[PDB]
Amino acid sequence: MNIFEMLRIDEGLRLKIYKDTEGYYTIGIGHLLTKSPSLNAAKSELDKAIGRNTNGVITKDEAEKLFNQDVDAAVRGILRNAKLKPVYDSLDAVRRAALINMVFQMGETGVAGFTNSLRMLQQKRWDEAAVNLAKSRWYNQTPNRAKRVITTFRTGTWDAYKNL
Ligand SMILES: [Cl-]
Ligand SMILES: [Cl-]
Ligand SMILES: [K+]
Numbered sequence: 557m558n559i560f561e562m563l564r565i566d567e568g569l570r571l572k573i574y575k576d577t578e579g580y581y582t583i584g585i586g587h588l589l590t591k592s593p594s595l596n597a598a599k600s601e602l603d604k605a606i607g608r609n610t611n612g613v614i615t616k617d618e619a620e621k622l623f624n625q626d627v628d629a630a631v632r633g634i635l636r637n638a639k640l641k642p643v644y645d646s647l648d649a650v651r652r653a654a655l656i657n658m659v660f661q662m663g664e665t666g667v668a669g670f671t672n673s674l675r676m677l678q679q680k681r682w683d684e685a686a687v688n689l690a691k692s693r694w695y696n697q698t699p700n701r702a703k704r705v706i707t708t709f710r711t712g713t714w715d716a717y718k719n720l
Contacts, residue, residue, distance in 0.1 A: 557714040557717055557718070558653065559627060559653040559656050559657070560623070560627060561717070562653055562657060562714075562717055563585065563586065563623070563627065563656075563657060563660055564585055564623075565717055565720055566586070566657065566661075566701050566704065566705075567585045567586030567660075568585070568586070569584065569585050569616070569619060570582075570583065570584070571583070571584070571613055571614055571615070571616065571619060572612055572613050573589065573595070573598055573599070573602065573612045573613075576588065577697065577698055578697075581595060581597075581598035583602060583612075583614060583619070583622075584614065584618070584619030584620075584622050584623060585619055585620070585622070585623040585626075586623075586626070586660065586661070587605070587619070587622040587623065587626055589601040589602055589605070599611065599612055602614070605622060606618055606622075626660060627656070627660065630656050630659040630660040630664075631656060633659055633663070633664035634655065634656065634659055634664065636664070637664050637668050639668040639671075639674060640655070640659070640664065640667065640668055640674075642678065643655065643674050643677055643678050646677075646678050646680075647677070648712055650708060650712050650713060650714060651677070651708065651709055651712055653708070654705050654706075654708040654709045655667070655677075655709075657705050657708075658694075658705060661694075661698075661701075662694065670689070670692070672688055673685050673688045673689045676688055677709065682709065682710050682711070682712070683710065685709055685710075686706045686707075686709060686710040689702070689705075689706050689709065690702065690706060703716070704716035704717060
């Protein structure tokens with residue numbers, strides 16, 4: 557298991573524009589296009605992202621290309637954030653992947669706001685962090701995924717993604 561495999565499990569792979577859990581147009585491996593309610597708008601972001609006139613459908617290679625960029629951007633976002641970085645730096649590799657996962661899903665700014673959980677994580681108070689993490693809109697709206705990620709932070713193992 558690794559961050560790419562992990563996120564591939566959590567985000568799926570769809571080659572045509574579709575609506576994510578929040579109703580926003582997305583494509584590929586969780587690549588958010590826009591929060592706009594306009595499909596045309598989404599198409600336009602897609603073409604720009606890929607560099608060609610696609611009309612809503614891309615290839616697997618194209619999907620993976622955005623995914624690579626998106627994973628890199630999540631990492632870069634963590635490293636650039638004064639709240640996130642210290643946390644990430646304090647973590648082991650498996651847990652680092654859990655944080656990358658959350659940032660990919662919610663964005664840098666979003667995760668940066670989980671002040672208390674962040675603190676518990678830095679303190680290495682695993683069980684407490686986990687309880688804290690679950691007290692969130694995130695957990696409530698995507699509970700199975702959230703549970704996976706929380707288990708990962710709890711345990712520092714890939715048990716939640718094992719056998720999937
Ligand atoms: Cl992009
Ligand atoms: Cl879920
Ligand atoms: K998805």
